[model samples]
Every structure is written in C-alpha cells, then in structure tokens.
Target: QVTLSQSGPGLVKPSQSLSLTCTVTSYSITSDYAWNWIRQFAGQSLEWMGYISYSGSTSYNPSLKSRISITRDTSKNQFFLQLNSVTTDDTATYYCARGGTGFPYWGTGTNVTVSAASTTAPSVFPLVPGSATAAASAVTLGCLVKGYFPEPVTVAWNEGALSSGVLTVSAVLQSGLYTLSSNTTVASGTWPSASVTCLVAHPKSSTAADKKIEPKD
Candidate 1:
C-alpha cells in the first residue's frame, strides 16, 4: 500500500531557503527505515522534523534540535530532510513518513511558508465526518492541522493542480510528541476528473479556508 507524492513550489518566502521532494513506487528506504518529517502551523500543533535511515539515523524537534537533518538515498530508494536558519518560526506545512511501528507508513504533503501570509492557516474539515474513500482508485485527504503550532500547516490543493504527481513533505518525533500532517491520494484517472481541495494553512488564523471533494457525479 504505497501512493506517496510531494511536489514543490506553492509559496515560500520567510528566511529564504526551502527544498521539498518525496517519491516512492512500492517502498524501500533500505528496509530498516524511519524516513519521517512533520509540520503544521496552519491549524496548529505539530513539529517533529527528524528521522532518517539508509544509515543516517537522526532525530530532531527539540525545538528543532539544532537546525535539522535526516538523510537517505539507497540509490533512489529515496529519503531526505534538511533545515537551516529558517525564520518565521520555520513556517509550516511539511510531511512525509514511513515508520510502521505505530502510525504513518506513507504521507505526502508540502506547502511551506515562513513569511507568506503571516497568520491564518487553519480551518480544515472536508468530508471529514467519518473520513473514508481512498480505497486506492482515488481519494486522499490526510490531516494534522488544527490551531497554530508548526508555523501553520499548508496543504491546500485548490481543487486541481499538478506539477509532479501532487503534494508531500516531512518531519517527525512522535510519542515524545512532534508529528506533522499533509497527505495525498487522488490518482486513479485524476480521482474521477477533478475537485480536490484540503486547505489548512495555519499561523494562528490569518485567512486560509478550504474544503471540497469530487468524483461522484
């Protein structure tokens, strides 16, 4: 069960430094993996940002644990994480995970902001009543945003957008707390042809509202 993706570019401007990428075909960050990162300040509460393998073995989020670093490649099995001097409180909206020890096996989300809107990034709850639909053929609206914490969480697809498969990011430190959220899963022929929005950009409420779903008509 793997459908991870994380494109790049959606608005990044604070300390001037950003990089996003998450790719997978089945899964293999060497096998003895951790590959995780978490963020969210749009709807608040979460910030892990540390977990790497393929032999790197790192951990962070002790308020960033001194910058940040989680790396891997395994000839393309893929894995990454790097943070340095980012202000705007490091902004938010990052994801990517694969630690089946308890939760998160694969999540793709990337919408970083350090100094974009400055406030208002949390107001998400779409088809979120029971949350179910991603049986593969299309349907993926993951979450972890709710009231300002990791700069304000960013995962707003706008209903139809693409650049490289569509959305993902990372950061992690679960249990001891520090878990980010932003996911993707709308493939299967474009999840029935359009309408995919799950906006949640948090920075203690500045103005980021979104919610929509499609493929039923």
Candidate 2:
C-alpha cells in the first residue's frame, strides 16, 4: 500500500491555523481509502487529525469540528489539514492515517508545539536531516540554491570536499530549471565545479532513497 509522509513547523500561536501536509506517494488515490489526519496533544493521547477520502469526503474530530477541514491537491499528490481558531489546547504532533478498527496505516507526524517557530530555530529538519558539518571555507561556500521545488537539492564540493554534506533543498522559483548554483568567498574556483541537485518530491513514491541525487557533469 502507498503511504504519506509529512513535515512542517513545530509551533504556532493562539487562534492560528494548523497547516501540515501528507504526501501520498506511490499510489494515485481512488475511492478505496481516505487520507487520515491524526494528532497527539503535547501531554495527551493520540487524536485523529481528520479523514479525507479521494472523492473529497471528510470526517473530522467532533471536538475539533469547527476548527478542522481537510483538502487534497492531486497535482501535488498531497493532502493538507487546516485547523482554524486553534488555541494552546491545539498544540500537538499531527499525522495522517488510513482508517480501520485495529491498527491504522499512519503518516509520519508533524509536530506543531505552539511557539514562535520563525523566531526560534527548529531542533532538527522537519524531515530526516541529511548529514552536515560546520566546515571552514575560503569562498564562504554556503551552497544552498533556492528553488520552488528543490527535489532534495544536492550540493557537493567537486574540488573542495574531503567528504560531502548532504542536504534537503527548497524548490526553485520560476527560473525554468530547478536552478543549481553555489556561493563562495571567491567567485572563481581554481577549476570551479560543484554538483548541485534539485529534489522532486512525489507523493506516492516508496523509498525516500529513490529521491537521491547524483549531480551530473
């Protein structure tokens, strides 16, 4: 069966909306199942985020009735859950799940812990973090090319790295290509060549490793 994985901020303020995503990769949604939204409060039990069927049918927690609504974007292969008028009581890790009696097929959860996410940095990347190092640079080569769809943007020091630091990149803007560029203290390299990547996230893909990057020559 196909599954969904998600990531987002870990905190928000009172009376705000909770916007998180469930990427249903590997399968085009049909009438058979609904994307589920589940949650567990900061100091409480696992609660249902909501349930959304492919046909667009939905069922939300009665307790969250006025605050919950689920929507699907087939183009992005993602389903989103929005909770309006949220309070501190709404702080929790939310997830997507498939419905059943016993065990449910669940989406990786997104933790919204209720704070100023932008003001403070996250403890870790929303998704599994790629390996990184605090390295010394001559060009100050902080190689993170921005994108609307960075597709797991890969950046490797072709000439400088003893080993490389893998990263998750953002999407390229309307630049036509999932643009690949790098920054350095020196504009010119002795033989400048860096392999930058653009990761494309598909909602129905199986192994995340399938999205790995091998920048071209």
Candidate 3:
C-alpha cells in the first residue's frame, strides 16, 4: 500500500512562485509509477497539472506548459511542484498522486492562496454537437467555456434552468485561466425547433454570458 504526505506554504505573494513537496512511503520514486501534481480551486474544479515518471520524464498540462514544473528526488523518495508567476487565480488546494493506470494513492492536500487582484470572465462558445454516440432519437450538444478566473461559475441550460441530461465537466487551468465544458442531450425530433442556450454566471460580471443554438429545418 502506498501513502503520500504533502507540505507547502499556505500563502503566496502574487507574481511569485508557489512550491510544494510530496513525500512518499512504501513506494520508491524510481519505480514504474508516475508521480503527479494536481490542484483544486475553491470553486471545486480540479486540475491535473503534471507528472514525473519513474525514468525522470515529465509531462505538464499545456495550459500551464511554460509556468509549471514537476521534479523528483529519487534518494529521498519525494517529488515537488513549482508554479511561477501566480495570481489570485492560482489559489487552490494542491495534491500529489500516484498515476500510471489510475490515481490510486493521493496526499492529504496542501491549500495555497496567491495574494492579489485579477478577474477574467469566461468566454462562452457556440453550442456544438458533442462527440458522444447518441441514440437515433436523441442528440448530444456541448458548450465550451474558456479563459476565466476565480471560479465558482454557475452554468445552466436554456437561460437559467437545468436539464435532466446536463453534464458539467470540472474546470481546468490553461495559460493562467480556467476552461470547462457543459453538455446535454435533447430528443432529435424536438431539436430542430428548440432554442437551446448555455448560460454562464461568473463573479467577475453582474451579467451572465450566454450562447444559443437553433437548427434550421
């Protein structure tokens, strides 16, 4: 059984770097497992930052490709996360996990908050057909929301209402911002005349951003 313990500063100044450490037990850092650094914002969206493989190879989320680093100390059986040029948007609970097939072991998590100002409202894209294999009687559609900060965005279908088939994915960080998608399905027969809308409510603005889709016969 593998176990992980995390330690790091809880507060960080804006424009500075945030660092955290993950110490592992019952598992060797040079083994075949991948060690990962993941984080979750206060809004509850989780982001998979990056990972260091047993061989020392590393992979990071493209959104943070240039600003994040994951390294390890094989002798100490520990790994680290370094994120630079952080802002208030970077405030989140950082975690360490063991990955390869799946994340079966996780650290207790270290909460870090970057000091300072910045708010970016989400950009709502046109509702497009999703990639799911839907039944002939139903069609799946998705809304892509990107470039937001300080999360907790509320998304709804049709202006301000939720639907039974809606599925909202957790937000991920990209280039210092946040991105997410919300998908839903509707009956094929009723889709042509339906006015489906994706509404996003963010704290950055008093008004919500929305996009609508209506297929013409």
Candidate 4:
C-alpha cells in the first residue's frame, strides 16, 4: 500500500502564491503510481487542480491555466504544487492522491487557509430609529468594512450567545480594492441586555469583530 504525506503552511496571504509538497511513502513515484492535486474551498466546491502522469507528463485545469504547476523531485520521491495569484476563494484544503487518470489510492489530506496580511475592522453604528430605514419592530444595526480583498466575506451579529445568521450588503470596487457593508435588524428588547456585535469574516482577518452598541429609546 502506498501512503501519501503532504506539507504546507496552514495559512497564506491573499494575492500571493502558495506552494505545497507531497511525499510518496513506501512507494515509487515514477512510472507506476499516478499523482494528482485535488482541492476544495470551504468544503463546498471540489476542483481537480491537475495531475502528473506516471510517464512524467502533466495536465492542468483550464480555469487555472498559467497559474498552476505540478512538479516532482525524483530524488526525494515527492511531488508538489505551485499555485500563483491565489485569493480568499483559494483558501482550501488540498489533497494529494495516487492516480494519473483516476485516483484509486487516497491519503488523509492537508489544509491551507489564505488570509490578508493587513485588514481593517468594521465601523459600527446604530441606525436611526423610527426613521424611513429602521425596522418597524426592531433596532437596526449597521457596520462597514473597507479596503479588503479576496472578495467574499461573512458578516453577522452576536447578541449575547445568539447571533444574526442573515446579513445584506453593498459592495463595490474602490480605487482598486473592495468594501463591505452590513445592515441587519435587531428585534426590540434585544439591545437592553444584548450589546450588538459585528462579526466580519474576511481573508485578512479570521476573528470576528464584536462591538458594543447603546440603543437609545
């Protein structure tokens, strides 16, 4: 039985390239066992990044063409991947398996999460109550995050232990980057004991931003 082992940093900076290594343990990497790089994002989508044949030929994903490379170190019995210009969407778990055309040998995979090197926290504010924009039955909470990358972000609110599962947004292209704004309604009486919190999940920041809000009656 052939066992595969992989190594890579658990985290990467967005817009940067990422490299990972896979070692063929107890098996020869040449002319017999085929190798492949398979990966998925947030456990939702699976992409067959590409593969290296037992004959040393390779095929790459057309979508990722020009940015993906599968190479090997014959002396070390290892194969690795070089992925360039990655984004938060590229933050995924990668696996190395045995197969050129079809994977029959499997191995426990490794994960590589990408984050931004620098991030700005969200700016929080209380929405005007009884105004044209406020929720009729509740207080509206709003926050904005600017100058972030990798595009997608998760915005939520924490009320004590309870959290806002839904969020709406207005995002746009800035000079060259992106901005994220979230506005959600908080049911009345929620502010008495609950300090409204903003939880923004971005590539640059993994920890959610929680803010205390004072709602005036």
Candidate 5:
C-alpha cells in the first residue's frame, strides 16, 4: 500500500510565495516514478504544474516558468514545491502524485488561498465523458473546457502536416466563469497511419493544452 502525503502553508499574502512537501511511503523516491504537482480550484478542472523525475531531472509548466521549482530529498523519500509571485488566482487545492506516463495515485489536497476575499485558467480535458467513435467510416472526438477565465480560446484538430477537419467552437457558458467545448468529426480512413491531435490556445494566459489520439484499427 503505497501513499503520497502533502503538507504546506495554506494561506499567503498577495505577491508572496508558497511551498509544499510530499512524503512517500512504501515507495522509494529513487524508484522509477516521477513525483508531480497538480492543483485545482473548487468545482474546476486541474492544471499539471510539472514533475521531477527520479533521476533529479525537472520540467515545469511554461506559464509558471521561472516561478516554480520542484525538488526532492532521496534520503527521506520526499519532494518539494516552491511557487513564487502568487496572486489570488493561485488559491486552490494542491496535490502530490506518483507520476509517469499518467498519474495513478494522488495525495489528499491542501487548500491554499492568497489573503483577502480572493478571486481565478483554461482547464481542458480531451475525449471526455465518452469514448471516441471508432466507426469504419468516420471518427469523432470531443474536448471539454471547464472554469476557463477571460475569453476567446481557439480549439483545433490537426492531422499530420496537413490539417483537414470540421471543428466547432461552442458558445461560451457562464457559471461565474466561462467554459467552452470543441468537437471534431472526420473520415477515419485518414487515420490508421496518421496522427490526430486536439489543441487549445488562448492569449489570456501563457498556458495551453493539447492531446493526441491513438489510431485504432
């Protein structure tokens, strides 16, 4: 029974930094798992902050580039997160997970809020709720966006170096925050050897999301 547990300061003043630690049990930090950080706002989708491999290599979300650092202590089988220049938008529950390929286990999150009556990203999920249709003649996939702030996000479908498909951007729905969705339906014959990708972009924040579909026989 392996577990990842998290601890950190749950409140901070505006422009302040935040730090958290993840302790592991029944699993070694020097093992093959990549330790990761992910956070989410209440009733919202999550953002992948990034991860540190067991080899000590690190990578982070581009939007959080210079302000986020992930490190660890192999002796204690623990990892850490240091996030700086935070605002109310950073207020959310932080989680730790043992990741690689896909995160399979997560820590109970800690809610971190920047002081004051706080305020709010584009969170995207591809091929959601339902599986993609694998009919012999056509293929269909969907992307769901929840709790995206500001406005105007572009969602597109691409095949190889050439892009050809019908894409529809949904009418933005408001729940105090804006959410939009996109879907694509195209001939499946163009895909057995080809690659299909769903990409989402918005100028509101440096963050963007993308997913690739595996070709099916």
Candidate 6:
C-alpha cells in the first residue's frame, strides 16, 4: 500500500525555476521503483517529463533535458523536480508517480501557472464543412483555432451548448504558441438552412471570437 503526496508553488515567474517535491508514504525512495514526473496541459495532452530510478540515475525528455533536473533525498523518502527558465508554455498540472513498467500510484497533481506580463488571445478561423455520413445523415463542421498562449480556451457551436458529436483536438505546441481544432456534427437537414457559429472564448480578452457559416443555397 503506497500513497504519494505532492507539494509545490502554484505560481512561478517567467524565466525562473519551478520546483516541486513528491513525498512518498509507506514506501522508500531507494526501493526498486522509478519515480516519474508528468504534466498535462490545458487540452488534456500529457507529457512524460522524466524519471529518477531507485539507484539514483535519471532520464529526461530530450526536449526538456536542457532545463529539467530530477533529484532525490533517500533519508526524506522524497524526490524533487526542478524546471528552469519556464514560460507561459510550461503552465500545466504536474503529477508525480511511481513506476518502472507502468505507473499505478500518482499524486493528486499540482497546478503551476507561469506568470507573464500579457496573455495571447486565440484567433478563430472560419468554419468549414467536413465529411458527411450518408447513412447517419449527419454533417460535420470544423473550426481551427491558433496562436494562443497559456492554453485555456473554449469552442462552442451556435448559441447553445452541444451535448454530443463534439470533439476538440489536443493543442499542438509550436515555438511557445498553441493551436487546435474543434468539430461538431449536426443533422444534415438542419445544416442546409442552419446559421452555424463557432465561438471561441479566451481569458485574455473580454470579447469572444466568433465566425458563422451558412449554405450558399
């Protein structure tokens, strides 16, 4: 029976180092297990940062190897994560887990926000028609969202909320910018005369970005 607890600062300044501690209970750091650190960005995309083994050796993601460091204190039965020179792109929920094969024990996760002087608002592209299923009599529409920072954004169809047939792709990171696409499906009969709208909301701006599409006929 093993449980993990995580403690860290909720906010970190840009270009500074972010530190987190994973405290193990009922288990020892020197035991035959690999301690890992993982993080999930705003779109629910997960990234394996790195891990420290029982023997004290470490491995890190090549992308982050330059700025990431993992260390442990056997006496305290805890491991630490140090990520330096972080920016808004590093904002995410960090979790610590125990594993060698697969992680079975994970901490509750700690949310870290990299403070910045400004935030980037998402740009909403015009809605485009997607492949329609003849048998299902449904039409799919997609909206492209790009150039956002800090990763929190929402996409909705029409003025009402969609309960089904909605899929939002995970955000793709490129040079500190994030892009993603969202799609929604509606009945074929409704699409011809429907004034469908794709509304994008971001915390950076008070006004939401919206684009509407309609059938030519």
Evaluation by lDDT, superior candidate among 3 and 6: 6
Scored by lDDT, model 6 comes in at 0.83
Error of 6 at 101 (Å): 2.7
lDDT of each: 0.59, 0.54, 0.81, 0.72, 0.75, 0.83
Tens digits of per-residue lDDT, candidate 4, 1-217, equal 7899888766678888899999888888885856999997775688998888777888888998789999999889999899998887888879999875678876667667677544444443444344454445666666667666544556666643545534666678666557767776667666656676666665444545555555555
CA RMSD of each candidate after superposition? 15.3, 12.2, 11.8, 8.2, 13.5, 8.5
Best by TM-score: 6
lDDT of 2 at 60: 77
Measured with C-alpha atoms, the lDDT of residue 176 in candidate 4 is: 52
lDDT: worst 10-residue window of model 3: 127-136
lDDT by residue (tens digit), candidate 2, 1-217: 7777877645567777778878877787654677787788756688765677778888777888777788888787888888887776777777777664543677766656553323311111112113342232432333434332212233334333423343323445363324434332422232135432223222211112112223223
Per-residue alpha-carbon lDDT of model 3 for 36-76, expressed as tens digits?
Answer: 99999888999999899999999999999999988888889
Give the candidates in order of lDDT, highest first. 6, 3, 5, 4, 1, 2
lDDT tens digits, residue span 1-217, model 6: 8899888876677999999999999988897889999999978999999999999999999999999999999999999999999998999999999987799999988777798535677887866554333554877777899987654677887765664788899889898778999988888777677578888887544448878865533
The predicted structure with the larger lDDT, 1 or 2, is: 1
Clashes of each: 40, 27, 1, 3, 0, 0
Local lDDT at 35 for model 2: 75
The C-alpha local distance difference test score for the whole of candidate 5 amounts to 0.75
lDDT at position 160, candidate 6 = 56
Error of 2 at 66 (Å): 1.1
Q: After superposition, how far is residue 44 of candidate 2 from its true place, in Å?
A: 4.4
On TM-score, the stronger of 5 and 6 is: 6
Candidate 4 to native Cα RMSD, angstroms: 8.2
- Worst lDDT window (10 residues) for model 1? 125-134
TM-score of each model, paired residue for residue: 0.26, 0.52, 0.53, 0.53, 0.53, 0.55
Q: What's the true lDDT of residue 37 in model 6?
A: 98
